[PDB]
């Protein structure tokens, strides 16, 4: 039915309005919020525009998903922090809502080109519920340090998306698809999202950091982790390719793995050289994941990941959690070992279970899912111009 | 070691050393680990004097590497137009296909070697032979933005 999507959008927006009326009441962190905002809407959205015939859907469904996500995440996170009471909205609430949007966009990267906008609204609602519950569990029950959210955002979003994409497996797409290919100007446009994410990631890892030493440490550690990650990602992209050519998939994504893998240890006293070690390992791991694990996941495990979010968010997020555990081992933080480990395990497990349930819901033929031949095509949901 | 020295002389352009090695008894059809014999390396590095001298010494012209590339394939990919002209003048198959189905015209078109494309078209190269992937020299030139190659391919037809 062509009216399912507008009906669900209108009903969800009316529900958001009612929930805000029921639960919501009314400046040094605003620039950091705007940096995170640019990361959410320009970074991910244009990062996903590499597909030659899916740019409209990439950027537009990014905008739609994140716009729904900030409202729903505001409501859910505020209800959790207020235990069902009314709560006020500051800059921190907006930052955390953008973080929930980031998690949903990371999961979107796994199912890009094979899902409808209606499926994306449903996934946004369910995933934000699961993410907010797991993040509350990590922050308040475990009380683990995840200021950059390698575990609660990146690993969670990646494995949630992987679980959804595994449930939504199509046999006709395992060997590939003719629309699943990049173009020259499409990769040029994807570089925009890559560069904005790279430039503004230090604010991503330091926005809600405790003011003082921790926030400055988060900024500096993220910056030098990304600086090392770029060099190592370039080097290993050349290393894994024939005749040492550079791969735009690697340069677009693996250059950002240092920001993911430094998130847990961002505000920790890991020193700039330790941050650069983490960034180099993240870039290497991301390139190796793109080159070797993504074909293994697509062909053997039947898990197709369109944007390779397992290589940018999943493996580097796990690496960040393990780095947090090791940093706790050597006195870089006063948080417990077992709580960091429990945060990692809970994030991964909750992501997998929530993704399974959400994908089982998304598998019902009620949401206008595209056919196998029509995957990675804007024309299923958009009016497309006649020329490029 | 004599074969290795002969192949190094082929790669470097040292015609005198390679001719001395051939006089000493080095085989004409010896090839390296990748299957590139002396004609392949001479075509790669653009040593026309070596190509002529090897062809005069009864080297096999239509021998392939493990990738399936003849000396004309290598000369077209490397853009050595004078080596291409010499090879075709000595009877090189302009329509030879590699293991993946590339032709010398396809290799010249993908690398924006306009004068090589010109010569191959003038020598009867078929610009309709597609690869395994289904690509033509026209398609690969359009993809890479080799506009002069596209223009000459559509003008020759």
């Amino acid at each position: 039915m062509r009216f399912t999507f507008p009906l669900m959008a209108i009903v969800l927006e009316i529900a958001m309005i009612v929930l805000f009326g029921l639960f919501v009441e009314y400046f040094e962190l605003y620039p950091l919020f705007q940096d995170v905002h640019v990361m959410i809407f320009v970074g991910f959205g244009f990062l996903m525009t590499f597909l030659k015939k899916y740019g409209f859907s990439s950027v537009g469904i990014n905008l739609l998903v994140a716009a729904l996500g900030l409202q729903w995440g505001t409501i859910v996170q505020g209800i959790l922090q207020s235990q069902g009471q009314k709560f006020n909205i500051g800059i921190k609430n907006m930052i955390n809502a953008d973080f929930s949007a980031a998690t949903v966009l990371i999961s979107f990267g796994a199912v890009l080109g094979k899902t409808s906008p209606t499926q994306m609204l449903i996934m946004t609602i369910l995933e934000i519920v699961f993410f907010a519950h797991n993040e509350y569990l990590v922050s308040e029950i475990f009380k683990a340090s995840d200021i950059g959210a390698s575990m609660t955002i990146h690993a969670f979003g990646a494995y949630f998306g992987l679980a959804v994409a595994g449930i939504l497996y199509r046999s006709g797409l395992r060997k590939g698809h003719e629309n699943e290919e990049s173009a020259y100007y499409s990769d040029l446009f994807a570089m925009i999202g890559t560069l904005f994410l790279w430039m503004f990631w230090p604010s991503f890892n330091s926005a809600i950091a405790e003011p003082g030493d921790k926030q400055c440490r988060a900024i500096v550690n993220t910056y030098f982790s990304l600086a090392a990650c770029v060099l190592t990602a370039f080097a290993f992209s050349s290393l894994v390719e024939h005749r040492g050519k550079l791969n735009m998939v690697h340069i677009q994504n693996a250059t950002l793995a240092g920001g993911v893998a430094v998130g847990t240890c961002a505000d920790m006293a890991i020193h700039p050289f330790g941050s650069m070690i983490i960034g180099s390992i993240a870039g290497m791991v991301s390139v190796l994941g793109y080159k070797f694990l993504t074909p293994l996941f697509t062909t053997k495990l039947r898990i197709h990941d369109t944007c390779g979010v397992h290589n940018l968010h999943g493996l580097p997020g796990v690496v960040g959690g393990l780095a947090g555990i090791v940093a706790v081992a050597m006195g870089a933080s006063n948080t417990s070992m077992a709580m960091q480990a429990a945060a990692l395990g809970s994030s991964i497990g909750t992501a997998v279970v929530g993704g399974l349930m959400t994908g089982l819901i998304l598998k019902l033929p009620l949401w206008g899912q595209p056919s196998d031949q029509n995957c990675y095509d804007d024309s299923v949901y958009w009016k497309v111009p006649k020329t490029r | 070691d004599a074969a290795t020295s002969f192949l190094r002389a082929a790669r470097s352009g040292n015609l005198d050393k390679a001719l001395d090695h051939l006089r000493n008894g080095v085989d004409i059809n010896t090839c390296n680990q990748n299957g590139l014999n002396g004609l392949h390396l001479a075509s790669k590095e653009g040593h026309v004097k070596m190509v002529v001298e090897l062809l005069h010494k009864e080297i096999i012209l239509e021998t392939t590497t493990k990738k399936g590339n003849t000396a004309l394939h290598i000369a077209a990919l490397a853009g050595q137009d004078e080596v291409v002209r010499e090879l075709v003048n000595y009877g090189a198959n302009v329509n030879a296909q590699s293991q993946k189905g590339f032709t010398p015209l396809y290799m010249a078109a993908q690398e924006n070697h306009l004068e090589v494309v010109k010569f191959l078209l003038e020598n009867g190269a078929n610009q309709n032979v597609a690869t395994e992937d289904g690509f033509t020299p026209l398609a690969v030139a359009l993809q890479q933005g080799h506009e002069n190659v596209v223009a000459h391919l559509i003008n020759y037809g």
Partner: protein
């Protein structure tokens, strides 16, 4: 020789990984870490980062088939240059204490290399760019140290010469390279980069200023000079074009005219009208440079060199109002030019070495030399 590019599968990864490992080891052995305006101070360095990665990264993406390499190589160059500049500014100005101010200054040093690389982009591979980054950061640091030793100024405050140093270094390196175009969508992406550069250039003109009123006046002067320069450039492009049309490529370079012209004297100009006069004069000189310099390789870097020289000259003129200091400042400028030229020559002869596997002159300005593309024959 073979126009098909030589395999860099062993050169580039080993070179980059060795560089990163050496940087990590040096940071371990020499770098050390350590309020109210933490975010305010972070904003300036963040503006410089946006102007380096996005502005200069996309400004040179106007090439028909070299936009990928322009953007990605600029990102790589920035990432390498900031780390190396942190270490070198630590070594030549003292353990290395890492603050946000030091990261901001390292970003400025890297931006010098990013400006220079526009003269050579499309004619070099990644390894040559690594060599250029290292040697140019070293030369700029050495120039600043020499100025600080001779004229008794602060090492960090000597980084004001970076426009003219970058321009002349890039010109020399491009002159040393072997001798040898646009598309609409890359031109629009280059307009994006140019707009970000033009919008944030008031941050380039006041990172090194401590007094708040000085930064205020510098940003005011840069903003008004840049506005006047944009108007003058867009309007006078038609005069300095054979077919009397506006050129996107000319605009991309000439919007920055007023910012470059008032860069060394923005904090000294007392009224906005003088900054606007300087922006107008810079725009007119940009028009004249476009109309004249091709007659007498990159025209935009040539006009940038002229604009930087003009900025130093107007600094000399304005500093007298606010004759020995004239001689001293002329000497500082000439020492900067001499060191830039000599170090650019050294870099150019280093880049000409066969070991770097530089692209063939027939293969310039082409992404297929460095990047993977589908449906291509690979190898022999």
């Amino acid at each position: 020789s073979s126009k098909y590019p030589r395999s860099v599968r062993r050169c580039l990864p080993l070179w980059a990984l060795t560089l990163e490992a050496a940087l990590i080891l040096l940071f371990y052995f020499f770098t050390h870490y350590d309020q109210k305006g933490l975010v305010a101070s972070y904003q300036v360095g963040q503006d410089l980062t946006v102007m380096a990665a996005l502005g200069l990264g996309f400004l040179t993406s106007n090439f028909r088939r070299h936009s990928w390499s322009s953007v990605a190589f600029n990102l790589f160059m920035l990432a390498l240059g900031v780390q190396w500049a942190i270490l070198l500014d630590g070594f030549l100005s003292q353990k290395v204490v890492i603050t946000l101010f030091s990261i901001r200054l390292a970003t400025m040093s890297a931006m010098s290399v990013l400006i220079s690389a526009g003269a050579v982009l499309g004619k070099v591979n990644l390894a040559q760019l690594v060599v250029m980054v290292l040697v140019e950061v070293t030369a700029l640091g050495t120039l600043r140290m020499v100025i600080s030793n001779i004229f008794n100024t602060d090492y960090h405050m000597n980084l004001r010469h970076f426009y003219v140093f970058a321009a002349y270094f890039g010109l020399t390196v491009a002159w040393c390279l072997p001798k040898p175009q646009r598309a609409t969508i890359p031109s629009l992406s280059a307009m994006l980069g140019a707009l970000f550069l033009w919008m944030f250039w008031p941050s380039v003109n006041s990172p090194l200023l401590r007094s708040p009123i000085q930064r205020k006046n510098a940003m005011f002067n840069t903003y008004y000079a840049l506005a006047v320069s944009v108007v003058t450039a867009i309007s006078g492009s038609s005069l300095a074009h054979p077919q009397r049309k506006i050129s996107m490529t000319y605009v991309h370079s000439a919007v920055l005219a007023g910012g470059v012209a008032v860069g060394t004297s923005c904090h000294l100009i007392p009224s906005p009208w003088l900054a606007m006069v300087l922006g107008l004069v810079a725009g007119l000189i940009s028009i004249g440079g476009a109309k004249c310099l091709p007659v007498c390789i990159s025209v935009m870097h040539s006009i940038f060199s002229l604009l930087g020289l003009l900025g130093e000259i107007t600094y000399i003129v304005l500093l007298v109002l606010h004759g020995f200091q004239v001689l001293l400042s002329i000497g500082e400028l000439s020492l900067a030019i001499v060191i830039a030229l000599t170090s650019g020559l050294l870099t150019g002869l280093l880049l000409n070495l066969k070991i770097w596997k530089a692209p063939h002159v027939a293969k310039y300005f082409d992404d297929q030399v460095f990047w993977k593309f589908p449906h291509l024959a690979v190898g022999f």
